[PDB]
Each structure stands twice: as C-alpha cells, then as structure tokens.
Amino acid sequence: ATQTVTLAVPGMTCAACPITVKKALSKVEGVSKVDVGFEKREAVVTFDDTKASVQKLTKATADAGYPSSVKQ
Template sequence: MQKFIVSLIFTLASLSAWADPQTVTLLLPTMNCAMCPITVKKALSQVEGVTKAKVSYEDKKAVVTFDDTHTSIEKLIEATTNAGYPSNVVETKTP
C-alpha cells in the first residue's frame, strides 16, 4: 500500500511537467517607436515560464506563450509595465 501511495504522489507531482502552454495577446498602446518591441520582448522573455514572445510595433501587440505553472498573465502585465509599457489582455488561448 505504501508503494502505491508513493507512486501516486510522484505521478501527481509530475503532472505539471505535461502542462499545456498558454497563449495570451497583450495590447501595448504606448509603444511609439520601432525600438519599443525590443524592450518589451526582452522584459517578457525574462519572466520565468515564458517560452515565446512575439511583439509587433505595427499592431501594438505582444503574443506570449508561457507555462502557467511557472507564471501568470498578471506577471506578464507587470513585466511590460515595469519596462515602461503598460499592457492589457486582448485574448487568451488554451489548447
């Protein structure tokens, strides 16, 4: 019985390793030059759990793929805000 319980605990603990990535689109209305996306992408990429960040000056949006077991949308917004570019959620996607 103890082996079963230990096995169950390890199985449940490892489920986060199979977590599906989440994607969020953030609106960045204060980006006003072609260099702004570089700063925003760097800030987002430094957030633990972010696997991809695509930032478009033309659309004033960032599409961020992340592991929600390591970060949250709130932390992504905090990262852009701290970099000088407050953002708002436009869309979220989960597989």
C-alpha cells in the first residue's frame, strides 16, 4: 500500500548523513509528502508504491550512505 507514516532515518549523530535520508524518501519513487531531518534522526514522509515501494526508497537510501526505515 502507499507509504504515509513515520520513517526511521539512520545517521542520527552522522556529520549530516540523515540530512540526505530526508530527501532520499521524497527523492526516490512513490514520493508524495515529506518530513525528515538529520537535526536528530527522524524520517517522516508519505510516499507510495503507486510507482515505487518501501524497500525501493529505503534501498536507494541505504545505497547512498544515508538510509531509512518504517516507523509509526
């Protein structure tokens, strides 16, 4: 189903790895809405499999050093 929920974004204390995880979600396919940041370590976004998938987004995210995860 679509992906409109909270997402965990690694990096946290990374010099700025999560700063990318945010875009990573709204940058891959399925994007729709976004709310993520490295200021701490939280990736809230609303994307959807209409043209992508959760593993796809996170996969492309974990493939750039800054990944993500699902959360509620």
